Amino acid sequence: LSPAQVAGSWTFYVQGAEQDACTVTLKKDRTFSAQVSCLQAWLGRTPTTWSPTPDGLLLIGKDGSQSLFLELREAGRYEGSVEGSKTLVMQRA
Numbered sequence: 001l002s003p004a005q006v007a008g009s010w011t012f013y014v015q016g017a018e019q020d021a022c023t024v025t026l027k028k029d030r031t032f033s034a035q036v037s038c039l040q041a042w043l044g045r046t047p048t049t050w051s052p053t054p055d056g057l058l059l060i061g062k063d064g065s066q067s068l069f070l071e072l073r074e075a076g077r078y079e080g081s082v083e084g085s086k087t088l089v090m091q092r093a
Contacts, residue, residue, distance in 0.1 A: 001072075003030055006052045008092065014042055015079075015087035026050055042088055043067050056080075057090075 007028040013021040022038035030049050039059070040046045045067040047059035057078050059067040068088060070080030076092035 001052050003052060004028055006050075006057065010090045010092055012039060012042075012088060012090050014082070015089055039067075039088075042082060042086070044083065 007026045009023060010026055011021050011023050022035060024035045024038070025033035027033065030051060032047065032050070036047060043059070045061035045065065047067040048062045049060045051058045051060060053069075056069055056071045057080075058069055059080075061067045068080045068082065070078035070088065070090060073079050078090045080088045080090075082088050
């Protein structure tokens with residue numbers, strides 16, 4: 001998937017904690033709307049950019065290092081294994 005095919009409105013939450021969900025725009029230029037601040041509660045490294053891969057998505061920190069890799073599960077859904085054996089879900093809408 002090109003960036004244009006992954007960009008847009010996404011909802012992030014930690015599996016089991018769906019009530020604590022954060023909507024973030026993935027901008028076409030591979031940045032995020034300011035709302036990405038919410039991922040600080042969940043990730044060690046706050047993401048500033050993103051990049052699609054053939055099978056998933058990279059959230060990347062300010063120094064160019066990996067904040068998280070998420071696997072593509074099905075159309076409009078990625079899931080990534082976080083430290084502390086948590087799963088971060090990102091789904092369109």
